[PDB]
Amino acid sequence: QVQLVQSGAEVKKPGASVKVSCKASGYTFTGTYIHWVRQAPGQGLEWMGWINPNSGGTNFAQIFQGRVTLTRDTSISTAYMDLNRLKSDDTAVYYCARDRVLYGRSFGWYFDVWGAGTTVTVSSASTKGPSVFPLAPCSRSTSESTAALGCLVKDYFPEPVTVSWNSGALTSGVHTFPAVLQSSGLYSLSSVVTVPSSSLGTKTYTCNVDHKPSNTKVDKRVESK
Amino acid sequence: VFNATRFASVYAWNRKRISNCVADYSVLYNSASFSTFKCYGVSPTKLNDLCFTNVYADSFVIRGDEVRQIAPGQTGKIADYNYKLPDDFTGCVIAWNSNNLDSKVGGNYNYLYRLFRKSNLKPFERDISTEIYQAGSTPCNGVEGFNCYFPLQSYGFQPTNGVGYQPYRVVVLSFELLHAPATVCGPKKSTNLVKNKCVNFNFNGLTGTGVLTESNKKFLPFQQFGRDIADTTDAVRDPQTLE
Amino acid sequence: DIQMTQSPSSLSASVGDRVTITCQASQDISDYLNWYQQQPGKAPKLLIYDASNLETGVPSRFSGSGSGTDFTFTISSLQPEDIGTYYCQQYDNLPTFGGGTKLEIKRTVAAPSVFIFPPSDEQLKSGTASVVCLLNNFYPREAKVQWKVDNALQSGNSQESVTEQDSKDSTYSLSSTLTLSKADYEKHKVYACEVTHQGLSSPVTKSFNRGE
Amino acid sequence: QCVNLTTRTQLPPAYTNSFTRGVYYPDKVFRSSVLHSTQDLFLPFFSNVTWFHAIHKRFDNPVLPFNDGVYFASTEKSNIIRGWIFGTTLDSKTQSLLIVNNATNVVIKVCEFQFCNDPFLGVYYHKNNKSWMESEFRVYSSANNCTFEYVSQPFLMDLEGKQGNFKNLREFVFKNIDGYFKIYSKHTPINLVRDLPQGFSALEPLVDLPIGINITRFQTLLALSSSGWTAGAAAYYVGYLQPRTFLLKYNENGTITDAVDCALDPLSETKCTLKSFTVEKGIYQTSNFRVQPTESIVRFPNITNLCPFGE
Ligand SMILES: *[C@@H]1O[C@H](CO)[C@@H](O[C@@H]2O[C@H](CO)[C@@H](O[C@H]3O[C@H](CO)[C@@H](O)[C@H](O)[C@@H]3O)[C@H](O)[C@H]2NC(C)=O)[C@H](O)[C@H]1NC(C)=O
Ligand SMILES: *[C@@H]1O[C@H](CO)[C@@H](O[C@@H]2O[C@H](CO)[C@@H](O[C@H]3O[C@H](CO)[C@@H](O)[C@H](O)[C@@H]3O)[C@H](O)[C@H]2NC(C)=O)[C@H](O)[C@H]1NC(C)=O
Ligand SMILES: *[C@@H]1O[C@H](CO)[C@@H](O[C@@H]2O[C@H](CO)[C@@H](O[C@H]3O[C@H](CO)[C@@H](O)[C@H](O)[C@@H]3O)[C@H](O)[C@H]2NC(C)=O)[C@H](O)[C@H]1NC(C)=O
Ligand SMILES: *[C@@H]1O[C@H](CO)[C@@H](O[C@@H]2O[C@H](CO)[C@@H](O[C@H]3O[C@H](CO)[C@@H](O)[C@H](O)[C@@H]3O)[C@H](O)[C@H]2NC(C)=O)[C@H](O)[C@H]1NC(C)=O
Ligand SMILES: *[C@@H]1O[C@H](CO[C@@H]2O[C@@H](C)[C@@H](O)[C@@H](O)[C@@H]2O)[C@@H](O[C@@H]2O[C@H](CO)[C@@H](O)[C@H](O)[C@H]2NC(C)=O)[C@H](O)[C@H]1NC(C)=O
Ligand SMILES: *[C@@H]1O[C@H](CO)[C@@H](O[C@@H]2O[C@H](CO)[C@@H](O)[C@H](O)[C@H]2NC(C)=O)[C@H](O)[C@H]1NC(C)=O
Ligand SMILES: *[C@@H]1O[C@H](CO)[C@@H](O)[C@H](O)[C@H]1NC(C)=O
Ligand SMILES: *[C@@H]1O[C@H](CO)[C@@H](O)[C@H](O)[C@H]1NC(C)=O
């Protein structure tokens, strides 16, 4: 068994710096190189550089040379990236991955084990908790057989806003949509549930919206009109 | 050891300690993948019937012309300046061609030897020094000068190189035998122990014929055997139960 | 630099069918190329190394072939656990990555369950009006939406988000939001969003008005 | 951190007699009731060992040669000698071996170290809690390419005690042969004020380190605003091994209880030639003598032109 464990998600201003660590365990740390690699939201993979933990020597993809620094402490078996003067477009998921212990070539990079990764988020704005609104079907008289209803989750910034229905018991017909960035730069999303039209006039529907960065945990009930 | 993706350089050759484990030298020696498998104080057929005190594997890469230098008592820039076996070496030298492991169409250059040294190095030493070598009668200071040289040189392993200029991976296994408490063995299963009867015994690969008695001798922790004036074994410590 | 480009950006494939993806280099790599699978919500995983050696424990269906500048990766019979993006990366000079190929499960056409929601009294109290358009459980992704106010299209103020391919029965859902000031929502008598999709023989319309 | 300690008195170098100390078990074999002849790197009998000390005022930790290997001993109280540095340059141009017994672990490490000019460890003394605590490890400023590391399972070492005589003798033999650094060791209780005691005991093998480095010199580590300090009292002795035959008396329990150094004097050579610790009245044939060569003489013709092998 082997493992690479990243730090929790990072949130920073443009022009600032971020330091992200991978704690290695289950194998000898100085045997093979550690790479750093990233992925922008919904996009392809992008390599930063590697470090050789036996030597501390490091090589970069050009674009990141003089922006990223890689380092490591051998006693604590931890590899780090320290990244200077964060662009807004440095908002991405980041990973580190190991240089193949057996059966390769002497040169070849591979990526034979990867950690779970971490998010770096870059924005000029401060932390803001979500507002939640009823996506409720117009006129009770205009649902015919099946109805849809929901929770518009609006203008909140610290990414990972989680949503659940009827204290998390309801899951049939539920969908939650990827959060999108506004022209203000903050996030918003929808969640919606499909239900029988006959139960809408008698059952209760409610959503719980949780936003740990703003310690904000808001419940509401969804009602016809 | 044998399938690791990348080996160490012959100038800076790696050493791994092998201990508290069962070896199966048949799985190694019966392989077709090895071009050299030469032992120096044991036959490779007998390695399965023995137990070993300490074992070390030394791992490095050289040119196919140079595998001849890894035998003990040889000489030339590998045996003189970066990897010498002792004249009374006991162990096995194991080597194979790496022209699909260590070799690149643009040249692989990750592997280096040592071209210069003020003296020949002693058995199983390694020199990491990047000091500039003064080949001339003049001293020099700073990074370079006339008849001052960098002491290392890189191999250019390309798959277009002829056999002999291709890379060879080398492993040297460098154990000692039947003289001290043992920690690595062949795959032999123990019997029960019987006393006061004539038996063909075998303790850690010490085979003999005799009767076993509970001794009143007081061995120290580092002693596995006792010897007679004829230098024959006349007491032993049972490796299962330490009496 | 050495560029890596993958020819198919995405593929729709049924269970048991053969899948092929191509990685094209800008320069002759000999065979210094590796292939990865990334499943939705997880890190990538190495499938083939050295352009044609299968990694330990990988299902026998996965394959790779070729030499020089051009390489294939193959699944001999795709199954539901294979769904994700597949990437090449080379190693002749730096580990440069390719653009990646997405795989989706192939399914019959299905028109959306299809809805709209006017801005709430709760949201209008914040000074902003967002009206949302919902399409639910359709298959051919390219579900085209448009917004209408007094039978004219607007620009620069709508957005859309699409939910990932359903693991239960291979469906897509997207919503489009049109965001406006409160006063812009007071100005216009009539709103709609309208759908063009392969499950529909004509584009569907579903208007509402303030107070209706 | 590294510091140049200055607050000490100047004394000339002391020396003492190593009577019959520095014998060790030559191999991993049991023997008993026998006189066994062995040829190895041993400390000669009655050889004149260099004497070093910490007092009050005095605290000497010089770089010393390591030619053919070392017999080291500390006559000691309060755990003041804490290990050693071994190598050639001692300054990260080359590799070196570090052995330290810090307050909680033995650490054995081999890397291109940049050691201090005078390396040491330091203890805060009797401070308020009526206790002593290690707080300084001024040994190296960097440790670059590192190829062997070991750390012991943890212990507690006491950093306290004061007596008018030393209580512990700890003896070590160090050899560096065929890439292996070999340690032999003994502890014996003592009760003496000063000077390496007259007596005999054999050192058991301790450990055998596969370090693969050249060693021509070594230095010891002692435990003590960055000058002005108290040295806890402790004595140490250094002698050098050289190749010579010893005849070893294994008692009936199989411990080396005595030895003859067969090169010490004509009576010791007679004891070895007769393979006996007692000799009768007589005249005995011993090794034939021989005047050894003073220098090498080479005589070749004064021909200088190279031979035409290109042709
Ligand atoms: C182990 O380390 C030793 C110390 O660096 C090293 O000894 C040095 O070896 C060279 C070559 O023999 C000597 O160089 C001098 O040789 C003669 C004088 O002996 C002169 O004519 C030359 O011009 C040159 O100056 C060094 O003097 C010598 N230093 C010492 C202190 O002895 C060993 O060679 C090393 N051994 C191994 C196996 O690495
Ligand atoms: C003597 O030298 C030792 C070697 O450098 C040094 O050992 C280090 O001690 C610390 C503290 O115990 C260890 O820290 C780890 O402790 C446990 C291990 O299970 C973990 O729970 C902790 O999170 C932490 O990782 C170091 O790992 C250890 N280093 C090594 C290489 O073993 C001693 O601290 C030194 N003692 C003095 C008094 O200086
Ligand atoms: C012993 O430690 C040395 C210092 O940590 C280390 O030297 C370093 O070696 C690497 C190459 O392996 C050099 O990296 C640079 O090499 C050239 C320089 O022209 C560049 O083309 C590369 O891009 C890269 O930046 C380091 O510069 C070099 N450092 C120093 C101070 O010389 C040795 O490699 C170590 N020895 C062993 C056995 O590992
Ligand atoms: C070899 O090792 C033996 C075990 O340590 C050791 O035997 C011990 O010798 C002493 C001294 O003769 C005995 O001491 C006791 O003697 C009598 C009882 O017989 C008492 O009156 C005394 O008070 C004292 O307790 C030990 O009893 C004895 N142990 C055994 C198990 O018999 C040998 O002396 C050692 N031989 C050599 C050459 O060192
Ligand atoms: C025999 O020739 C070799 C090498 O071949 C020659 O290389 C050139 C020098 C040139 O003469 C070519 O036409 C030949 O093909 C000689 O090796 C050289 O020796 C010198 C020292 O005399 C050395 O500085 C060079 O580096 C060597 N060059 C090479 C390429 O090896 C060799 O000396 C000759 N043999 C004898 C016995 O004279
Ligand atoms: C401690 O003293 C030593 C020498 O007594 C100093 O070492 C010198 O360092 C300089 C560079 O600062 C070199 O030019 C010399 O060649 C060195 N001499 C020796 C004998 O090594 C050391 O710098 C001093 N350190 C402190 C902290 O004072
Ligand atoms: C021991 O050696 C020194 C020289 O290093 C010498 O002066 C001294 O007389 C010797 N000691 C004895 C007791 O002879
Ligand atoms: C007493 O010991 C504690 C540790 O137990 C230490 O933190 C403190 O500094 C000590 N106080 C004095 C005066 O030495």
XYZ file of N, CA, C and O in Angstrom, chain A residues 35 37 39 42-47 60-61 95 100 103-105 107-112 114-115 132-139 142 146-149 152 154 175-178 180-183 190 192 194 220, chain C residues 1 31-32 34 36 38 42-46 49-50 55-56 87 89-91 94-95 97-99 102 115 117-118 120 122-123 126 130 132 134-137 159-163 171 173-175 177 179 208 212:
408
model
N 6.329 14.648 -9.587
C 5.813 15.690 -10.471
C 4.704 16.491 -9.795
O 3.945 15.940 -9.001
N 1.252 18.648 -11.331
C 0.391 18.764 -12.518
C -0.960 19.367 -12.117
O -1.393 19.225 -10.974
N -5.155 20.893 -13.635
C -6.291 20.804 -14.538
C -7.248 21.972 -14.269
O -7.811 22.083 -13.178
N -13.058 21.830 -16.028
C -13.597 21.160 -17.222
C -12.623 21.014 -18.406
O -13.071 20.735 -19.521
N -11.318 21.225 -18.193
C -10.270 21.263 -19.229
C -9.281 20.076 -19.131
O -9.440 19.162 -18.317
N -8.256 20.074 -19.990
C -7.176 19.080 -20.017
C -6.065 19.291 -18.976
O -5.977 20.337 -18.326
N -5.213 18.272 -18.823
C -4.086 18.237 -17.882
C -2.899 19.106 -18.346
O -2.662 19.297 -19.541
N -2.145 19.628 -17.381
C -1.103 20.636 -17.575
C 0.025 20.461 -16.545
O -0.178 20.618 -15.343
N 1.215 20.069 -16.999
C 2.356 19.772 -16.124
C 3.120 21.034 -15.684
O 3.340 21.948 -16.481
N 11.273 22.354 -14.814
C 9.939 22.931 -15.030
C 9.521 22.925 -16.504
O 10.353 23.012 -17.411
N 8.215 22.919 -16.756
C 7.677 23.395 -18.025
C 7.798 24.929 -18.103
O 6.930 25.632 -17.596
N -2.504 18.467 -8.498
C -2.086 17.138 -8.071
C -0.557 17.061 -8.021
O 0.140 17.804 -8.718
N 7.135 6.249 -11.335
C 7.324 4.799 -11.636
C 8.518 3.979 -11.057
O 9.583 3.834 -11.665
N 9.722 -1.423 -13.857
C 9.378 -1.824 -15.232
C 9.397 -0.744 -16.336
O 9.104 -1.064 -17.491
N 9.741 0.514 -16.048
C 9.829 1.573 -17.069
C 11.127 1.568 -17.897
O 11.734 0.526 -18.134
N 11.586 2.780 -18.112
C 12.887 3.056 -18.667
C 13.592 3.934 -17.599
O 13.038 4.248 -16.523
N 14.632 7.040 -18.234
C 13.890 8.258 -18.532
C 12.441 7.872 -18.890
O 12.214 6.889 -19.600
N 11.439 8.621 -18.430
C 10.100 8.451 -19.002
C 8.908 9.078 -18.290
O 7.817 9.107 -18.861
N 9.116 9.620 -17.091
C 8.154 10.406 -16.319
C 6.945 9.606 -15.813
O 6.756 9.486 -14.603
N 6.148 9.017 -16.714
C 4.914 8.281 -16.394
C 4.033 9.125 -15.440
O 4.194 10.342 -15.431
N 3.125 8.515 -14.666
C 2.562 9.049 -13.409
C 1.917 7.862 -12.651
O 0.724 7.594 -12.807
N 2.711 7.059 -11.932
C 2.305 5.698 -11.518
C 1.392 5.637 -10.279
O 0.578 4.718 -10.157
N -1.002 8.824 -7.991
C -1.443 10.213 -7.837
C -2.162 10.372 -6.497
O -2.934 9.490 -6.107
N -1.979 11.505 -5.819
C -2.824 11.839 -4.664
C -4.237 12.276 -5.077
O -4.512 12.498 -6.257
N -30.586 31.517 -1.177
C -31.353 30.439 -1.826
C -32.806 30.840 -2.074
O -33.493 31.318 -1.171
N -33.281 30.605 -3.300
C -34.583 31.061 -3.793
C -35.447 29.892 -4.314
O -34.909 28.829 -4.651
N -36.788 29.993 -4.283
C -37.684 28.946 -4.779
C -37.819 28.956 -6.310
O -38.445 29.844 -6.890
N -37.302 27.908 -6.958
C -37.650 27.568 -8.344
C -38.974 26.796 -8.343
O -38.985 25.578 -8.485
N -40.081 27.474 -8.056
C -41.375 26.830 -7.837
C -42.322 27.026 -9.040
O -42.460 28.161 -9.517
N -43.012 25.969 -9.516
C -43.797 26.010 -10.746
C -44.928 27.040 -10.673
O -45.713 27.074 -9.720
N -44.988 27.907 -11.687
C -45.993 28.961 -11.789
C -47.393 28.350 -11.962
O -47.541 27.374 -12.702
N -48.390 28.925 -11.276
C -49.799 28.488 -11.207
C -50.017 26.991 -10.895
O -49.842 26.117 -11.743
N -51.564 24.694 -13.513
C -50.771 24.379 -14.723
C -49.670 23.322 -14.512
O -48.714 23.266 -15.288
N -46.600 15.276 -14.120
C -45.329 15.468 -13.402
C -45.023 16.956 -13.277
O -45.298 17.728 -14.197
N -44.414 17.354 -12.166
C -43.980 18.716 -11.882
C -42.472 18.738 -11.597
O -41.913 17.739 -11.144
N -41.819 19.869 -11.849
C -40.445 20.128 -11.434
C -40.402 21.358 -10.516
O -41.159 22.309 -10.717
N -39.522 21.339 -9.517
C -39.337 22.419 -8.542
C -37.907 22.403 -7.981
O -37.216 21.394 -8.115
N -32.605 27.607 -6.435
C -31.601 28.466 -7.058
C -30.656 28.946 -5.958
O -31.104 29.618 -5.032
N -27.412 31.121 -5.020
C -27.014 32.346 -5.706
C -25.893 33.089 -4.983
O -25.876 33.180 -3.755
N -31.678 16.386 -9.249
C -30.428 16.770 -9.922
C -29.809 18.020 -9.281
O -30.517 18.920 -8.827
N -28.476 18.089 -9.252
C -27.708 19.277 -8.840
C -26.712 19.628 -9.941
O -25.956 18.762 -10.392
N -26.712 20.884 -10.380
C -26.025 21.339 -11.586
C -24.679 21.984 -11.216
O -24.608 22.665 -10.189
N -23.605 21.787 -12.008
C -22.311 22.417 -11.759
C -22.413 23.934 -11.560
O -23.080 24.634 -12.328
N -21.449 27.782 -11.786
C -20.913 28.638 -12.850
C -20.523 30.004 -12.290
O -21.150 30.525 -11.366
N -19.443 30.568 -12.829
C -18.948 31.898 -12.468
C -19.757 33.004 -13.173
O -19.965 32.969 -14.389
N -20.205 33.997 -12.411
C -20.910 35.176 -12.921
C -19.947 36.250 -13.465
O -18.733 36.190 -13.250
N -20.495 37.287 -14.109
C -19.749 38.498 -14.496
C -19.200 39.272 -13.284
O -18.146 39.902 -13.388
N -28.026 25.714 -9.694
C -29.386 25.222 -9.455
C -29.378 23.770 -8.947
O -28.498 22.962 -9.263
N -32.796 20.895 -8.760
C -34.217 20.679 -9.059
C -34.578 19.214 -8.868
O -33.750 18.318 -9.036
N -37.927 16.381 -9.711
C -39.174 16.053 -10.412
C -40.054 15.144 -9.552
O -39.584 14.165 -8.963
N -34.848 25.984 3.458
C -36.149 26.563 3.075
C -37.153 25.528 2.563
O -36.765 24.528 1.954
N 9.636 22.721 -28.148
C 8.439 22.039 -27.592
C 7.974 20.915 -28.529
O 8.275 20.948 -29.723
N 8.443 5.822 -29.538
C 7.425 5.154 -28.710
C 7.398 5.726 -27.272
O 6.827 5.131 -26.358
N 7.998 6.903 -27.060
C 8.072 7.606 -25.778
C 6.741 8.318 -25.447
O 6.654 9.547 -25.435
N 2.723 7.651 -23.222
C 1.894 6.942 -22.237
C 0.426 7.410 -22.312
O 0.157 8.540 -22.722
N -3.559 7.559 -20.252
C -4.241 7.675 -18.958
C -5.763 7.714 -19.114
O -6.263 8.229 -20.109
N -9.057 9.307 -16.874
C -9.613 10.053 -15.747
C -11.131 9.841 -15.649
O -11.891 10.276 -16.515
N -12.368 12.117 -9.934
C -11.145 11.447 -9.440
C -9.894 11.864 -10.232
O -9.987 12.429 -11.326
N -8.713 11.581 -9.679
C -7.433 11.742 -10.373
C -7.288 10.770 -11.576
O -7.908 9.699 -11.579
N -6.469 11.103 -12.593
C -6.106 10.185 -13.676
C -5.399 8.902 -13.197
O -4.836 8.844 -12.101
N -5.411 7.868 -14.042
C -4.802 6.552 -13.798
C -4.070 6.076 -15.057
O -4.617 6.193 -16.149
N -2.845 5.562 -14.938
C -2.022 5.096 -16.070
C -2.509 3.728 -16.592
O -2.605 2.773 -15.826
N 1.758 2.154 -20.753
C 3.062 2.816 -20.792
C 3.851 2.398 -22.044
O 3.527 1.404 -22.694
N 4.886 3.153 -22.412
C 5.715 2.832 -23.595
C 4.921 2.533 -24.883
O 5.249 1.624 -25.646
N -0.371 -1.835 -18.085
C 0.000 -1.786 -16.666
C -0.635 -2.921 -15.827
O -1.639 -3.524 -16.209
N -0.054 -3.223 -14.663
C -0.515 -4.258 -13.717
C -1.974 -4.065 -13.279
O -2.402 -2.957 -12.956
N -6.349 10.470 -21.978
C -5.282 11.420 -22.326
C -3.984 10.706 -22.717
O -3.573 9.780 -22.019
N 0.255 11.396 -22.870
C 1.406 12.234 -22.488
C 2.716 11.623 -23.006
O 2.917 10.415 -22.920
N 3.595 12.450 -23.566
C 4.857 11.954 -24.123
C 6.065 12.157 -23.209
O 5.960 12.795 -22.161
N 7.212 11.610 -23.612
C 8.441 11.744 -22.812
C 9.739 11.745 -23.605
O 10.730 11.198 -23.137
N 10.408 16.596 -22.002
C 9.387 16.943 -20.995
C 8.092 16.101 -21.102
O 7.704 15.681 -22.195
N 7.366 15.857 -19.996
C 6.065 15.193 -20.032
C 4.935 16.127 -20.511
O 4.054 16.516 -19.738
N 1.434 16.922 -22.196
C 0.122 16.271 -22.309
C -0.600 16.599 -23.626
O -0.452 17.692 -24.180
N -1.444 15.673 -24.087
C -2.454 15.882 -25.127
C -3.788 16.442 -24.607
O -4.032 16.509 -23.399
N -4.666 16.851 -25.530
C -5.937 17.529 -25.225
C -7.040 16.656 -24.601
O -7.943 17.190 -23.953
N -13.097 12.526 -24.493
C -14.194 12.086 -23.609
C -14.902 10.847 -24.178
O -15.137 10.783 -25.383
N -39.291 22.767 -18.767
C -39.911 23.651 -17.766
C -39.297 25.065 -17.767
O -38.271 25.312 -18.408
N -39.175 28.707 -14.769
C -39.563 29.294 -13.477
C -39.333 30.824 -13.438
O -38.177 31.263 -13.463
N -40.410 31.640 -13.369
C -40.346 33.087 -13.122
C -39.575 33.467 -11.840
O -39.501 32.655 -10.910
N -38.712 34.782 -8.179
C -39.485 34.699 -6.929
C -39.577 36.037 -6.190
O -38.674 36.870 -6.269
N -39.010 36.467 -3.135
C -37.794 36.426 -2.320
C -36.574 36.996 -3.062
O -35.815 37.775 -2.477
N -36.389 36.640 -4.339
C -35.266 37.122 -5.148
C -35.470 38.561 -5.631
O -34.549 39.372 -5.537
N -34.276 41.249 -3.420
C -32.829 41.537 -3.480
C -32.423 42.534 -4.585
O -31.253 42.913 -4.671
N -33.902 36.787 -11.844
C -33.414 35.640 -12.610
C -34.579 34.712 -12.937
O -35.244 34.186 -12.044
N -35.366 31.117 -14.995
C -34.594 29.925 -15.374
C -35.415 28.979 -16.235
O -36.615 28.800 -16.037
N -35.432 25.021 -17.717
C -34.968 23.674 -17.365
C -35.261 22.667 -18.483
O -36.394 22.573 -18.962
N -34.244 21.898 -18.871
C -34.353 20.704 -19.701
C -33.793 19.510 -18.914
O -32.660 19.540 -18.432
N -34.561 18.429 -18.820
C -34.256 17.299 -17.952
C -34.316 15.949 -18.690
O -35.213 15.707 -19.496
N -33.380 15.039 -18.468
C -33.460 13.704 -19.112
C -33.663 13.479 -20.648
O -34.605 12.814 -21.076
N -26.817 32.701 -19.018
C -25.790 31.671 -18.807
C -26.435 30.276 -18.828
O -27.657 30.148 -18.772
N -25.631 29.217 -18.909
C -26.113 27.832 -18.839
C -25.154 26.918 -18.056
O -23.937 27.132 -18.035
N -25.710 25.877 -17.431
C -24.957 24.798 -16.783
C -25.584 23.438 -17.090
O -26.806 23.290 -17.044
N -24.745 22.443 -17.397
C -25.137 21.079 -17.792
C -24.637 20.045 -16.778
O -23.450 19.962 -16.465
N -25.565 19.253 -16.244
C -25.288 18.136 -15.331
C -24.634 16.967 -16.082
O -24.974 16.682 -17.231
N -28.508 9.899 -19.463
C -29.314 11.086 -19.743
C -28.511 12.349 -19.431
O -27.549 12.310 -18.654
N -29.116 16.687 -18.445
C -29.976 17.789 -18.021
C -29.161 19.076 -18.056
O -28.016 19.083 -17.606
N -29.741 20.174 -18.527
C -29.143 21.504 -18.438
C -30.210 22.518 -18.045
O -31.393 22.344 -18.350
N -29.780 23.579 -17.378
C -30.603 24.766 -17.194
C -29.902 25.977 -17.793
O -28.674 26.093 -17.721
N -30.142 30.180 -17.344
C -30.640 31.290 -16.531
C -30.515 32.576 -17.329
O -29.428 32.879 -17.819
N -30.575 36.485 -16.385
C -30.530 37.440 -15.262
C -30.648 38.879 -15.752
O -29.998 39.282 -16.717
N -44.561 32.440 -20.238
C -45.321 32.989 -19.105
C -45.174 34.524 -19.042
O -44.274 35.109 -19.651
N -48.982 35.782 -14.251
C -49.603 34.627 -14.923
C -48.719 33.373 -14.816
O -47.745 33.207 -15.562
